[model samples]
Target chain A: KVAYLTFDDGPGKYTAELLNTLKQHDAKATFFLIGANVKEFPDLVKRENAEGHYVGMHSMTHNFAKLYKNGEYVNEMKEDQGLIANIIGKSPKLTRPPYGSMPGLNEGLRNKVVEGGFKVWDWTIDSLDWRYNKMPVDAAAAQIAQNVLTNATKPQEVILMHDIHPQSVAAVPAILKGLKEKGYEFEAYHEESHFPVNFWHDNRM
Target chain B: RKVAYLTFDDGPGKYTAELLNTLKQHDAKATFFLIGANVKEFPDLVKRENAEGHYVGMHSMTHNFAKLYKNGEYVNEMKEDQGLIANIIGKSPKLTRPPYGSMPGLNEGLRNKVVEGGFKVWDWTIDSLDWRYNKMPVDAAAAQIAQNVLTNATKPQEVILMHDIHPQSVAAVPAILKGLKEKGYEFEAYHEESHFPVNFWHDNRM
Candidate 1:
């Protein structure tokens, strides 16, 4: 089957290791990077693109209310897209609505998203690796794999993880092997074969 | 009740008979959204699908996106396919899944037109992605095939997309059936009498 192993809040301290770990496993992923994080680690974002991973927008603030306020969501995504585009040399149209799209990307919000030419994706599995941020990498990685594999019944699963956490970065090998043993291919989101996985129920996304 | 509508698209093709048998073994009923050209070529398959208690619905006359949407042949295609299916099943099915889904092409205006044509539209919640795995090793692809449907199927009602045209998809049907069955999904087909809102836009009128 297919699994989109997506990393949110990336270009952090562990992103390089996460990239290395993904490379070691011959896997690919979608990185929904924060604008500030990308600015801090532009090289990693470029390297992420150079290595064939899908680099997408995750907004500048990552603030739930500010981004969700009357008119800031699309603007922030546009601004974030510009930041990544300035680095990676191409605008990424796919985005992951921080804290997911529901209740925020409502009918009107979803319309703005579609009209703005952006695709949104929410996860099929919430890996919750960020929960184990301060735990032992060995044990936390185990939990990460467990969280993903437990919910990974579908071949095409979009798993939410964060490269900002070292344990989550370290979880890559075990998680990759766990999914591979269960018969999965680590794939990234491509607009060419865009699969709608958003809560907004907008296929255009 | 927990329900799953397993849907197949683009055919009643060469692999359909085996797919039907596999589905039958699971006591599962699926909705097949058929293309007009293939249905005309394999009308027996359409007849067989209906006879075997599977819901047969129209996809389009031509799977061509530009031809279907570019020339404003969207309604024409589904209605025409509906006509072909009626000839085979003796009842014109009013349900359809617009090819490649209803978005990007189906603006609210186009979606409204779809409803005005007296058809219920359905877009899937889970896509099997089995169509792309055909050339790979059959067994592995089969495992991959059903996993997406099962994983994303935490919802009470799921409209799962698959296609009978591919051998890989046919092979994966059993896993899809068993995996979903394991998760306590009662397989059902879309019946006009008990329709639900399934369009991407969340428009109940569609």
Candidate 2:
């Protein structure tokens, strides 16, 4: 069993703590960074690269309106690619659409994205950590773990968690331990292992 | 800085227990390419191999190079082996090893069909000639096997060829682990998501 733990909207104050937890557990994960966050916490992104975690674009602005309605979805991702390139020295072609690739990245946008030579990843396991953002650390992290453990029926699972939330960062240890207990080996995303993971049912993605 | 993907072929025999024990002692993981008939004869060992976190991949039913390469038996034989391994392990792996390498055997069209059959073929970098040293005394054979592995392991990422059925190969493993560790290399099992290319034909997709 393989678990791809992906954190979105990150490189915040909690990013360091999340990376530390991953190191302590000897686990590797993927981070989907917003451009502004990448600019603010370039060093955290650098640490992510040095430590073997994957860092990918999560758009310049996570705002749904600018991304979907204004049709800046591809533009924002391309812009964020430039920012990540400057930070990491390699333009990351893998990305996660702001919310998900579903309703937003219909056919036209999907075509442009593929033409832009980018791959989209939408997760199978949603930790729902963002929903418990305001709750206490223990209470919130527990629920996050519950959603993940119960929902992890597939052999290959890409889990969605928001590292921008403190509770989500707190859930790191429990998540890694729980998955390992369930016979899951933690892995970060790599191009060689890639298959189409987008919600659009596009194999090219 | 380095990862050693040690692969053992022709397994699930009397030496299985010793090989698994040595791997556990070093906290190492590896890929086992099992022959389907041997898998049926030793299903429990295969189960334990998967349970212990080592990958089990198909290495064909008849390791007969002629039977595998000619008579259109390649895909079906691999699929048959894949089914047998999946019956015990629940998960079917797309990765497989060509019994005697793929260059002279698999041509362009045959290789295309291999890809279309949804199998990823892998060959190895360093051939640990443990099989060739079966006639020597155990200590000397193990030493020769260790030299075959360590001497050629100059690259950062090495996919090493080994065999688990031989007592020499099992005896050679602890030293192999320690020697690689001395060279700053960590042991790793293959994962489908992090698949690395190592084939004679040089097909990156495989």
Candidate 3:
């Protein structure tokens, strides 16, 4: 079985540490790179791409109130997608929005993003990293590992993780180890294996 | 024969006339849980929905974010919503779609108040997310409808949610209706089962 270990919200102070942890485990990750951090840490992003990791766009603002207030959607998607392009050098074709919160995407915004050539990626597995240290790092790792180990019946597993939290980095060793021990093949997502990189929308309206 | 009263929300301004036209052309009758702002502007659509064998249900008065999110005022909020809907639809709507399906909230007391207000709360079996701004792949949207209808509806019943406020939904209706109808389904305006403690919330804060 193949596993796609994905991380989000980074290229921050913790990104390098997370990268080092990945290096220790000989694992490749998909970074759902947020737009705001891309300008500040372009090198880390380049390193992420250089290290054979997949990079997709997450939102720039990470603010839910502004992004998904029902009626005021056109102003938000257009602005966020452009910001992603500016930070990432080239606009990503796929994105995962800030909070995975979408309130009934209106048609106009939908047409705009589809015209822009993008698809949104909502995760199958929620890392619950937003709740971070509220749960033990090992327990969190166990939660992730258990989910993939049991559920990755398909050839590709699109697992969700976060690099913004230190505990997430700390949990990586066990997650990678557990997956490797379970005889899972760790691989990067390519057009052939997983769905295309959705540069357009990740269900955030 | 499983029949679904597929309803759309937040409409009757620009798109409702077109939707009514489409529904008439197809000879399909469906329910509409309308928002008050749109209802106030185009009372004719409410009239049309009921007059043409479709059910007219209540969404909310203001569809307000502050009212639903403020805590403890939903009973009053819903009462006002029901009153407005009653004025237009000619009777208190026993069927309510709650502003955003937020009925399971309102606590025990407030929930009791909502029931006491003579509104029966309903939750949808399928969510089209049409009014949702995300450019969801048509395949994903289709799959969600197919999968949920197959999984959630054990009996010959369904209440599918679609929003009339968007064009993509209007665009997808032909395909969605055709796909589901081909799966051995029919259409209706009433529900046979009641699962207590249903809910919906407008997270938009709008």
Candidate 4:
């Protein structure tokens, strides 16, 4: 397989526009939809499934402090699965935690996710879209291209994009065009037992 | 009566405790825009600044070209500065000053983050140039002060910049105060320069 260009935290106001961009390029990608957006835009969720794009859960509330402060691990597990079931007619078996991975979340989060029949996969490459530095557009695009070229390995690749900004959506066309030039085949996110493992080590070894 | 807040920058390491005591002795309320490392090591100086009714605005954490110029770490550096100040002084300062008074570019997210952290970054209108010479001799520093006040003190409200990091600066304080007081300019602790003519740092040098 070439690359499965995946995205998270959307079905947003910009998702339709992003989908159109992907369609124009004939690229299939994965979308991890946030519960809040799924509740608001159910039609977009159905369209994603119907269009053969993969759908997964983010969280119901997506509050950082709640998870960080209250140790809301079990709640994250319950709410995330509920959202995936609500949208894709089944709970997705994969997730990417907010802000990559933060400490203070109880171990129950992993247990609950595993128990609920989902696997968690964090991206090896991050485009740093949420940051704005000097030459923001150019810097962000360069980072994305660099990460993709270096880290796209044999087994699996799940891409992460935030649809909240127009810059990210604009980057998709060039990314697709570039990836196509590299001769990579694109596939939708797979929700089976065979999912890519998050890079977290068990520490038991 | 218009108020002119006399603020000092890059302080609280060598001469800061003395500066705090000097301001205390004179019953003068001056603002000290402190560096984070200074606050981290000698938190009592930061406490003294607050107790003496001095405004404790932030300068920087590292004061590096990278931290000040790089947009990615700007918010992180600013937040670190603000966090140190708030912890020591027990109050979130509403003002900040970028290190070297030079910002490469203001990123939108970083700007919003700074604003959310409850601070308005400041730049000085009157520069004492206390750090000009290897160390400016007291007389030369005093002369610069007199000339700057004579020029910049024309307005009712003023925000003058000086550094207490140098021993000679502490020596120039008496003359500096006398010169400003002669202009009928009262001292205000915080900078509220929204009304006065806004002078940018680039204009200050040119």
Candidate 5:
């Protein structure tokens, strides 16, 4: 089995720790960087790119109203792309919407995201780390680990987690360790891999 | 196993009677999401739909996009429509399909209102687009609907959109149904108390 670990809304306090854990395991992941947070921690974004991990654009403000109101997503992500390019010296090709691909996006808006030069990614398995944020670090980690283990039956799994929360970051170690022991190989996402940019086809895989 | 959920929207129109007859001939069950204004005109059709063992769902009282997409517009309009449908069918419908697919307008905020008002909103994976308003030839429209059904049959479950209001859409249904059946696809009507949640938003929280 092959799994792609993607973290969104990052360059937060626990991002560096999450990077360190991935490095220790000799694994690579994709980070969907928020423009505001990237400005706060450019070094972490720099480190993510420098360490061979993928850095992609999330949004400038991560504001749903501004981003999704009448196909504003194109301008929002384009601005985000410029932010990432300004810091990393390259525009990210990957973009995942704030909540998901379909909550606010329509056909025209989705086409704009693709037309704006982004590989929009929506996850198959949402670990619900945000819900488990209040639990003890070990307990939260166990929940996330169990979530991935239970849902990783597919040959290609794109597991979603957030590095912004300390508990979510803490859970990565167990997630990496558990998946590794289960004979699953970690793979980074590429637009050519035929993994759908929209979540409508998620059940087909 | 490929499963197809046949759905007709903006229904109980000129072509709905013929479409219902075709469904009966095939021994197939499909879901009808009726517009409230159409339901008011064709209350007997609504009663016949329920009596014939087809699922009746609320589309909207008025198919006005401008009015339906606004804040609190969906809740009041759907409840009013639900009441009208329940008056005829003897039961309130639990399913809803917004005038358009619930995107670009139906935000999480609006979706919560729809769900809270006791309706599970549905969106189609495959759009037959038979309501393309005669943009395509009749044969071409039928071909497009059939091709979409075959293409999306890779997934075990599929929800397809068609309009009973349009004659071309009704014309396309026979070939679409026959082609899907030839591909080992089974047609099912939408039921709130289904054996499984086959819709894409089955696990959707927001």
Candidate 6:
């Protein structure tokens, strides 16, 4: 089995520590970073790429209300994507919706996003790291570890976590170790992971 | 009521310009899956293919199937070509066809990588075998194409494969177009919305 570890809403202060932990494990993960946070910590985005981890757009501002009002979130994403592309030398084709919701996105608005050329991704397994911010480190780690063992059934899965919180960052080692013990391999997120299996009738496979 | 999407692979060769002239004469548009090196050699043809509203897609940079199919090299090779094509065409192409139709090396993992790279990977339902029979008479090759679509086709909406790089294949286009028109098939340029299989890859909402 395979698991893709992804962190959202990041490039914060804890990002350096998260990078260190990921490197110690020799693991690669995908980070969906907020645009404003990326501006404050451009070096972090640079480090994420330099260290061989993938980074994706997480919006300029994580305001679902104003951003998702009339598919305005896409433009926010585009603006943020431009910033990322400028830094990384190529526009990232992957994005994650803020809070994973599209309150007002109609079909036309949705078409505009795809036309803008991005593949938006949500998660297959929620690590619940966002839920237990105040919980003890071990407890939060256990919840994350349990979530993977309990919910990950597919050979390939996208496990969602965030780096903005201390406890969530604290859970990384255990999640990696536990999944490794269960014969699950941690893989770097490819933009291809954002697509479905049977995407075309004449798929080469 | 049937439809057919004519796809010419490995183009921008000597015959590509000639084939494009034929397509223009018939007022028909086809998708050209181009190689990166060929585009470098014949940048003008790639531009004209795009300029004439024909869909231009990446085939491969080096048609070395074994090298491209290993260790996710397919994705890397495609990205290199995509960058090249985007530089030439002013926009990146959303379509791709693996060299030789995804056989011999396109496993499930590779297919996922291709799609994730934001390509609509296409394989043909009808093989004109033009690449193999290029030494045959042009009319004979055209007859084979006509037989594939008009006599033996199983699906009404067929993605027919031919190569613009082959003189025999290019010579066969007029008859293929005329025969398909006689059979009541509407020719279309392949588009994701109109011609591709249902893609469940992207969640377009928000």
Fnat: each model in turn: 0.00, 0.00, 0.17, 0.00, 0.00, 0.00
Instruction: Name the lDDT of candidate 6.
Output: 0.76
lDDT, candidate 6, A97-138, per-residue tens: 777643244334444666788676667788887778877878
Residues B1-206 of candidate 4 have per-residue lDDT tens digits of 65667888887778777767766665678888877788888888888878878788887787775556564565577678888888876777657666666332444455666556655766655666666633556677667665755566643456778888877676577666777777777766874443222223221111
lDDT of 3 by residue, A1-205 (tens): 7777888888787898888888876778777776667768878887887787777776666666655654333344445556555544555555565665344444454555556565566555655556655577676756655554565555555677788876677667766877676777677665334464233322322
Q: Flag regions of model 5 displaced more than 4 Å.
A: A1-26, A34-51, A61-71, A82-90, A97-185, A190-205, B182-184, B195-206
Candidate 4: CAPRI quality band? incorrect
The TM-score-based order of candidates, best leading, equals: 5, 1, 2, 4, 3, 6
Pick the winner on lDDT between candidates 1 and 2: 2
lDDT string, candidate 1, B1-206, tens digits = 68999899999899999988888888889899999889989988999999999899999988888887666688888989998999888998999898988744566667778888888889877777888896789999988877867777876678888888988888888887888788889888889898766755546676
Model 2 misplaced regions, further than 4 Å? A1-205
By TM-score, who's the top model here? 5
The DockQ leader among the candidates is 5
Cα deviation at B24, candidate 1, in Å, is 1.5
Candidate 4 lands at a TM-score of 0.50
Q: Where does model 6 exceed 4 Å of error?
A: A101-105, A192-194, A197-205, B1-206
Label model 2 with its docking quality class: incorrect
Off by over 4 Å in 3: A70-89, A101-108, A134-155, A191-205, B1-206
User: lDDT of candidate 2?
Assistant: 0.86
**Backbone clashes in model 6, listed as residue pairs:** A192-B116
Model 6 fnat?
Answer: 0.00
The residue-by-residue lDDT of candidate 2 on B1-206, one tens digit each, is 78999999998889998899889988999999999889999999999999999999998899886787776577778899999999998998999898877745666677887899889998877788789887879989998899878886755678999999988888999889999999999999999998756775546667
* lDDT measured at residue B121 in model 4 versus the true structure, 0 to 100: 60
* List of clashing residue pairs for candidate 4: A93-A118, A93-A119
* DockQ of predicted model 3: 0.09
